[PDB]
């Protein structure tokens, strides 16, 4: 299947002379392998998947350097944006950066992205084609200009199109055991009456990887929707994911309703029905 490497940085200011908070995390598909964290006890880039504890002192001296670097630039940005937005020093504000790699089923480059937020809003971002920028608002425009002067798109692109894929395909190979699984969802369907004239049906997907999944519910043929509770997909904590879908149905008519599961591990899409 396709695969993807992503890095997520978050920097939060604190009122006054306090130092900001900084957090780095790096993922392969849906699997965290590295964290850094200013509030933590190490001030190094620490490992989180067992296949990355494989990497030697150099790798960890370097990443730590890269992380500290970003953090420095984040801390400066926070001062700047505060000016640009005309804001007191009383407030805690937030600065968020996502960037990374997508490769297709042959591990050839598919696409990449770089995106930066300020107080939960898009601020600036690299266009899909990795050459141009979208600036929300006119403080972003000042940035756009600065970053154009410094050929920032080119640099990021050279990374995205190169080392990022390079190393991803390394970690796929080093991670081969774990990262390269596809785990089909395990289903069941619970039935509990909620009145003398209605019953709840719940459709469960459990123990699947990666996260992307699609449960839905239909009555006769075509679909209910609106009428169905559906929890957002969630982590179980052992590197797999869960989700369920639920509709209340007229009691005694529960063998009209049917439930559909779609996922990459499932060669052929399941339709589940109350299985009493």
């Amino acid at each position: 299947g396709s695969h993807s490497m992503r890095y997520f940085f978050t920097s939060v200011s604190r009122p006054g002379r306090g130092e900001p908070r900084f957090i780095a995390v790096g993922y392969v598909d849906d699997t965290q392998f590295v964290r850094f964290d200013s509030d933590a006890a190490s001030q190094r880039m620490e490992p989180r998947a067992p296949w990355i504890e494989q990497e030697g002192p150099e790798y960890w001296d370097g990443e730590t350097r890269k992380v500290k670097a970003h953090s420095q630039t984040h801390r400066v940005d926070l001062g700047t944006l505060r000016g640009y937005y005309n804001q007191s020093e009383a407030g805690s504000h937030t600065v968020q950066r996502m960037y990374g790699c997508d490769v297709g089923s042959d591990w050839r480059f598919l696409r990449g992205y770089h995106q930066y937020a300020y107080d939960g809003k898009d601020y600036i971002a690299l266009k899909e084609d990795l050459r141009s920028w979208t600036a929300a608002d006119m403080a972003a425009q000042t940035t756009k200009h600065k970053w154009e002067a410094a050929h920032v798109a080119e640099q990021l692109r050279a990374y995205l199109e190169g080392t990022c894929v390079e190393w991803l395909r390394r970690y796929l190979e080093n991670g081969k055991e774990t990262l390269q699984r596809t785990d089909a969802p395990k289903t069941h369907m619970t039935h509990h009456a909620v009145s003398d004239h209605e019953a709840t049906l719940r459709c469960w997907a459990l123990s699947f990887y990666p996260a992307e999944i699609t449960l839905t519910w239909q009555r006769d043929g075509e679909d209910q929707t609106q009428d169905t509770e559906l929890v957002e997909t969630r982590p179980a904590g052992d590197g797999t994911f869960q989700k369920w879908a639920a509709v209340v149905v007229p009691s005694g008519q529960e063998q009209r309703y049917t439930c559909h599961v779609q996922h990459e591990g499932l060669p052929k899409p399941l339709t589940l029905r109350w299985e009493p």
């Binding site: 890269k66 770089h114 990022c164």
Partner: peptide, 10 residues
């Protein structure tokens, strides 16, 4: 492997 190029003040 984080990027070492392309990250610079706004």
């Amino acid at each position: 492997f984080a990027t070492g190029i392309g990250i610079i003040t706004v």
